Curated annotation (Swiss-Prot), chain A:
Belongs to the TmoB/XamoB family. Optimum pH is 6.8. This is Toluene-4-monooxygenase system, hydroxylase component subunit gamma. The keyword Oxidoreductase applies. Pathway: Xenobiotic degradation; toluene degradation. Component of the toluene-4-monooxygenase multicomponent enzyme system which catalyzes the O2- and NADH-dependent hydroxylation of toluene to form p-cresol. Also able to convert benzene to phenol, catechol, and 1,2,3-trihydroxybenzene by successive hydroxylations. InterPro entries: TmoB-like_sf, Toluene_mOase_B. Its EC number is 1.14.13.236. It catalyses: toluene + NADH + O2 + H(+) = 4-methylphenol + NAD(+) + H2O. It comes from Ectopseudomonas mendocina. GO terms for molecular function: toluene 4-monooxygenase activity. The keyword Protease does not apply.
UniProtKB/Swiss-Prot annotation, chain C:
Inhibited by Zn(2+) and Cu(2+). The lineage of its organism: Bacteria, Pseudomonadati, Pseudomonadota, Gammaproteobacteria, Pseudomonadales. The keyword Oxidoreductase applies. The alkene monooxygenase multicomponent enzyme system is composed of an electron transfer component and a monooxygenase component interacting with the effector protein TmoD. The electron transfer component is composed of a ferredoxin reductase (TmoF) and a ferredoxin (TmoC), and the monooxygenase component is formed by a heterohexamer (dimer of heterotrimers) of two alpha subunits (TmoA), two beta subunits (TmoE) and two gamma subunits (TmoB). Keywords: Aromatic hydrocarbons catabolism, Monooxygenase, NAD, Oxidoreductase. GO terms for biological process: toluene catabolic process. One of its GO terms (molecular function) is toluene 4-monooxygenase activity. Pfam families: Phenol_Hydrox. It comes from the Bacteria. Disruption phenotype: Cells lacking this gene show a complete loss of toluene-4-monooxygenase activity. Component of the toluene-4-monooxygenase multicomponent enzyme system which catalyzes the O2- and NADH-dependent hydroxylation of toluene to form p-cresol. Also able to convert benzene to phenol, catechol, and 1,2,3-trihydroxybenzene by successive hydroxylations. This is Toluene-4-monooxygenase system, hydroxylase component subunit beta. The gene is tmoE. It comes from Ectopseudomonas mendocina. Optimum pH is 6.8.
From Swiss-Prot, chains E, F:
It comes from Ectopseudomonas mendocina. The alkene monooxygenase multicomponent enzyme system is composed of an electron transfer component and a monooxygenase component interacting with the effector protein TmoD. The electron transfer component is composed of a ferredoxin reductase (TmoF) and a ferredoxin (TmoC), and the monooxygenase component is formed by a heterohexamer (dimer of heterotrimers) of two alpha subunits (TmoA), two beta subunits (TmoE) and two gamma subunits (TmoB). The gene is tmoA. Fe cation 2 binds at residues 133, 196, 230, 233. Binds 2 Fe(2+) ions per subunit. This is Toluene-4-monooxygenase system, hydroxylase component subunit alpha. It catalyses: toluene + NADH + O2 + H(+) = 4-methylphenol + NAD(+) + H2O. Pfam families: Phenol_Hydrox (PF02332). Its EC number is 1.14.13.236.
Amino acid sequence: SAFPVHAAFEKDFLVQLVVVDLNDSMDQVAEKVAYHCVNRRVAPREGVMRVRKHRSTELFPRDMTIAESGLNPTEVIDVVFE
Amino acid sequence: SAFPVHAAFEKDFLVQLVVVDLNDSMDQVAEKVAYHCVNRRVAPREGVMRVRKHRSTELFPRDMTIAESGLNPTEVIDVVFEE
Amino acid sequence: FESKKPMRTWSHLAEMPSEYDIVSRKLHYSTNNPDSPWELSPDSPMNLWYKQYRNASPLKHDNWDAFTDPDQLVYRTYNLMQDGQESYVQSLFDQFNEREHDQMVREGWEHTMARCYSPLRYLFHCLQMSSAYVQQMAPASTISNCCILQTADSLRWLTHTAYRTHELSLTYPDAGLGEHERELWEKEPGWQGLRELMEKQLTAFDWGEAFVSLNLVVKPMIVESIFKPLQQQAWENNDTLLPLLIDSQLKDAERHSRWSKALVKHALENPDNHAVIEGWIEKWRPLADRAAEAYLSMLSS
Amino acid sequence: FESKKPMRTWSHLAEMRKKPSEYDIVSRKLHYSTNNPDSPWELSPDSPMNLWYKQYRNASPLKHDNWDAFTDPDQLVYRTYNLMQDGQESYVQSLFDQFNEREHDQMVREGWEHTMARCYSPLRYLFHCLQMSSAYVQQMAPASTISNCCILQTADSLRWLTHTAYRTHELSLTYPDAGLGEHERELWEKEPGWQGLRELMEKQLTAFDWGEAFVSLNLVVKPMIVESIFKPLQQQAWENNDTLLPLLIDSQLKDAERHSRWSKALVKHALENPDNHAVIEGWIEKWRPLADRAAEAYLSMLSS
Amino acid sequence: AMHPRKDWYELTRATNWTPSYVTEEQLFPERMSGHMGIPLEKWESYDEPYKTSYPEYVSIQREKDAGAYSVKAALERAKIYENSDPGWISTLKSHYGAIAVGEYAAVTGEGRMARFSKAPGNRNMATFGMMDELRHGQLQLFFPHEYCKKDRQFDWAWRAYHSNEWAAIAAKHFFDDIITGRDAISVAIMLTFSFETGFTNMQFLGLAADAAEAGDYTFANLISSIQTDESRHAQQGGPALQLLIENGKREEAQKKVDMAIWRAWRLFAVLTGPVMDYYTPLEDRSQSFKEFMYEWIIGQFERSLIDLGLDKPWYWDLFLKDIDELHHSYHMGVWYWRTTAWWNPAAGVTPEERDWLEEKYPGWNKRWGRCWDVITENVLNDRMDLVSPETLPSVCNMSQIPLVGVPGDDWNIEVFSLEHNGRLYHFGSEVDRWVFQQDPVQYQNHMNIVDRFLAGQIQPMTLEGALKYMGFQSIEEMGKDAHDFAWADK
Amino acid sequence: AMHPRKDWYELTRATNWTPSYVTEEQLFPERMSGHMGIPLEKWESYDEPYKTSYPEYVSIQREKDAGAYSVKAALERAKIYENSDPGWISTLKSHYGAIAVGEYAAVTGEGRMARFSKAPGNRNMATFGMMDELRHGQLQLFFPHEYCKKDRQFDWAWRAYHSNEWAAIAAKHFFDDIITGRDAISVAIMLTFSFETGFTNMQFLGLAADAAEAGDYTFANLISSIQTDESRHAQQGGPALQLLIENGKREEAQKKVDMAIWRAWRLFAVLTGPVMDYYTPLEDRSQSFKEFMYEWIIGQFERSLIDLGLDKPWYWDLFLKDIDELHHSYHMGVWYWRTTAWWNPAAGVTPEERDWLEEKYPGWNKRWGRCWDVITENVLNDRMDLVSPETLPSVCNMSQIPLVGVPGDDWNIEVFSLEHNGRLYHFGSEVDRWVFQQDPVQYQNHMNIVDRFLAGQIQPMTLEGALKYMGFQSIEEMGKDAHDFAWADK
Ligand SMILES: [Cl-]
Ligand SMILES: [Fe+3]
Ligand SMILES: [Fe+3]
Ligand SMILES: [Fe+3]
Ligand SMILES: [Fe+3]
Ligand SMILES: [Mg+2]
Ligand SMILES: [Mg+2]
Ligand SMILES: [Mg+2]
Ligand SMILES: [Mg+2]
Ligand SMILES: [Mg+2]
Ligand SMILES: [Mg+2]
Ligand SMILES: [Mg+2]
Ligand SMILES: [Mg+2]
Ligand SMILES: [Mg+2]
């Protein structure tokens, strides 16, 4: 159930390939993306990591799964705070 | 009354032109040569200085002058310490 | 990955280099990926062009890159050699002009030159265009390099012809020299065999057919049926310049024959290529025959 | 002693220049042997070579305030001479190769090989005399800019000698029974048509005054060779279906014309002193009759 | 005597004729010629401004090579490899890999014009162009060959274009688009006017100066020599553009220039931007990359376009903004993913260097500095795991370079995507997507390296598998920090 | 086709003939030809071993200059003058002054043979020799000219031979004796066999290596290029010696070799000896001057002489002793009288260097070390008056170099004098006196600079008056300590 996304993490300089799973929650998706950004090129922060379609203003629910999100493989997401 | 000699001073590395006077004694000639050698390339030494024709064994008397000596201009002399 | 020491030459050469090998060998990365010669859509127009006219050529070898110019020329040594040849031609032109050579040719020779010599600039430029085509399509950089130098040599001949066309016109201003050559190329019967031959040859787009038709048929015909007869006629008409100029051009032409014959030898390592090369020679030879015959009838007229 | 700034070029040029030509930098005022009129060379003033130079250079009737100011009109240096001549030799060597390939020599008119053996191949002696004579003017000339023209002219003479050696051998391959490469010394020594030229050169080679040497060699001998040897040989070659020789001679005549050019420039320089007109004219009148006799004898032989 | 070139030059390009045994279109098919339907006779007005002739060419070029090779030989004891700054050695490695076999590819762009251009003067100048680019390809193989014995990364002077290394794919995608993959008139416009006249001419002048500063006179001389060839063939585009404009194809001409300048810029930003602002020692930086773009590239484009009767491309303000930002992110990426490069990137973020960056790019520290702060503290704590990547960057489906933006306090990153014939494409700028849509058949089925990764072509499906796919053959070939992290010591 | 040189070469030197209109002796006067009464026919046996032809010559020499000048141009902005060690700069200054216009003088030696040698092969090879030395003179003027604007001492590249500076007089007295002031066969023997084959070949090879070590690749390349010309004309002497021996003139051949080798040695010891053992940085000394003389000059002479059927010169044991001693005294003199040189001598007597000198010349510190001890103490006490002379050294009437000996513990100095035709001459060795007596008419009325001083030719009669006479034109031109005495406080 591998599910590739292209993810841009808040305050990082690029978009990266992150392969997540169809049944991952958004919380779990954010954690998998953060692994490749936080304490590498982005300072660690308190606050809730949220996922959204790239450049959109609406956030996915934290416990919504990739499978029910309406996202398609290889679409671009942002991982942001608050 | 200038008189040119070529002089080699004991322990120096070369022969130099030194212009002396017909009426200079050999002592005075040795001092004029020494001026151009001692404390320049040759360590100062105590002792009487003597003059001889180059590579000669015989020395000129100390109070003999250049004119008295029969030396000819541009001949070579050694200046060496007394034995 | 493991640790490895530096190699003394390129990795592709190291398990076996001349200056020639170092700077000439295996540079066409466009042969690496059969379905995508170029780093573009596999169906981009130029990728389709190369897949048809290079990759799919009926002339086949598993290692075209192993071809070696028998003269092993590089840009540096080509210019050394050709500067010497152009020094020769420059002194030829300068000194023959000083002694008013063109005034001394036999009566009427200027009209033979206007008709049979000055329009060669069109033939030579066709060779130039054609050699550039074989350059860009050939499946090995060592082959392409021979074609580059041959393209340059063709421009060399064109330039010689331009210079002498103008110069001759200074002594013979009423012969149409430098004025009538396009019309002759287009309409004079003696040129129409050559023009038909080159128009058709320039639209043979398979790299192998292009090479065989140009270098094994057209160019040897030009040596035997144009260059050499022109020398003989010149001598007979007290033109001592043209044969000496052609001597230097024939040096280029023999070099073209030398690398061409070496490429055929390479190709024939695949026994299937004999029939393919022979088939193209048999196809093109009749056009070349007619080109020669029409030209020689015009030259002898 | 005072403090002075660096000079941008040599001190001898630094007044009138900031950056002279390459030619000036490497050619001008190099004969230190003219600095001391009593001792050209740093030896006894009466050493044999000092006596020679005081007599045959310094005391020449040909006089000038400033020979060093002479300038080669071509301003040639070693580097630019070799560039030029490598080109000319590429031309000639290519001609040799191509004419050999088409067996040019076998197609000359009947008898031409005998005219070549008699009138062409012994030119190696004449050309070597020119080489020797040019070297003499080199070593005696009172300015390095004059001497440099002479060096290059010595080299050109050797160039011509070498052409002649090459072609003598080559022609003998096609014509083995004409004495080519075998009889030239005897011809030079004993054949009437060569004796004018031989007498001329033996006498010219023993004119040791630098000025007389220059005038006899470059204003009399060498122009005669152009007019009475090179050009007639050229015309006769064409008439005999020898196409190579005239082309070869045209390359050699390019050298000869260059020699004429710097020679004319030296005369113009010399004539800044009006006394030199009579000196040069006198030497030309002295030597021309020998040169004319040489030409006439050669031409009778050529045409026989 | 010799007759002056001006008296016989016209006969050298009096070579057009009216075909009869084949048609004009068969002889010059539009797909290879790019004549846009403009008939033969109109092309005879084409006039190259800087003329030359074969005898002159072989004479001057003989002299040029005599110098270039004599200097190389005379300085072989200088030991540049051992005595140069690591920054300079990496500059050489990057340059030779990105350029040498690309120069040889340019022979084919020139050959395309030599055969298929309808303009006689173009066909002749392109013949000299074939020879020039042959020279440049051979020079830039012969010279780095000397260093093979010192360092396997110099093998990439030959190997890069034969590889699937990501920067090599970006170079090949660009050069196959503007040099080898389009018709003759497109090559004239995109290669000779937009790329060579527009970028490489001034770049090579800059690089030769840099080489002298680095004490590498063999390379300074080599690059200077190559630059003196440029105008002879780079001149071909101008007259082509004039001809198009005069014959109703202004918008077509503008479009090709627009496309080529942007594509050149993105590659230039990844290859040269980091060298100028980060690899070059601080004391030897005469100006910033931005100042260079403004001084030597942008203004020249503006005035050369106006002279032709063209306009500044539609994206000019985007271009200007990009010069402030793009190469800083590209540099960060090349360094963080240094193991995928065939040279050793210099981080270039010592305190004194960051002061210079702040001066040249006000606000640099609040942007890229935030990332380098994290990286720098990790280096100081010897957290090598945190300065080594474990995933791939997302890659532009046009430039083949990763998708970047501005980091830190002004975080802004934008991907421009496109659904096209059932496939989702991603682009690193509005202009790159536009280029795609201008000629989709050129691009649409191309797979970038991440597409191949996702499609199963790269095994194992890991960064390690990707390094193997990219053509690395030993541990030593993969990029490392140019200074072994000594920069963090102070 | 072309015919190989062996097929036609003989005809190029088939140029002797029997004169009729003048005599053989008129055409080839003994004073200019040096044929020693040997008739023309015998000279036809002369056979130069290494054949050359004109087309080959202009082609090869064209290539050599292409390289030499292109290297100079490409290194123009490398700032060698500013970045070289002072010892190297002084080495350059000394070299160019002593050599450049002397090379041009060698044209005349070669020209003497070209006109007056009775051997045809000699006359042709001498013609190439004229050309070779023209090259060398022009090269060695063009190359230092660049430095004039930096340093007035480089003016002496041109000025030295035009001056009465003492070392210039020594050089001119030697070169006018062996190159320009004798008959053709003497030139062949004394210049091409003795000096060029015998000394300059190995000297130039050594100097090119020293240049590379010093980082001066332009000069390294230049000197190497010049050395490649030497064999072409230096070959002329051997065949001339063989011919003399074959024709009953062995005694005369030996005498001329004996003379030439000794005269070359004394000048070599003053010009190159100090450079090798004192100017060259200690770390870059591969062998001592003595070791160089032994293993590259003396042994090679021994073997070449035996090969020709000649003997070691009578003075060989004196020669061997001299290489232990002479140049140490010459160096001391050049340094102490440095104000009279156009270069800046390096003292070369730091403790580390004195240790090396002691290793290479056991007993050095007991001898020359004693003088340097006094000099060093005076420098430390800033007694500049005591490290600058007031008087003139006595000068050899042959070599024109001052009369020296061994100083210190083992003091020994010997002047060899001669009364001749009413005048008293002084010589620096038994051999120098012997050379004078071999050919007194060459030498007898020459006045050395001290003779001139005593004859009232130099006013004022002081060392300062002498400096003016020697041609110095500013304070800057006069020699100073190369390191501004930095070596003393070490
Ligand atoms: Cl001082
Ligand atoms: Fe290029
Ligand atoms: Fe280019
Ligand atoms: Fe020399
Ligand atoms: Fe020499
Ligand atoms: Mg779960
Ligand atoms: Mg397909
Ligand atoms: Mg094979
Ligand atoms: Mg006309
Ligand atoms: Mg038929
Ligand atoms: Mg004077
Ligand atoms: Mg004047
Ligand atoms: Mg570690
Ligand atoms: Mg004092």
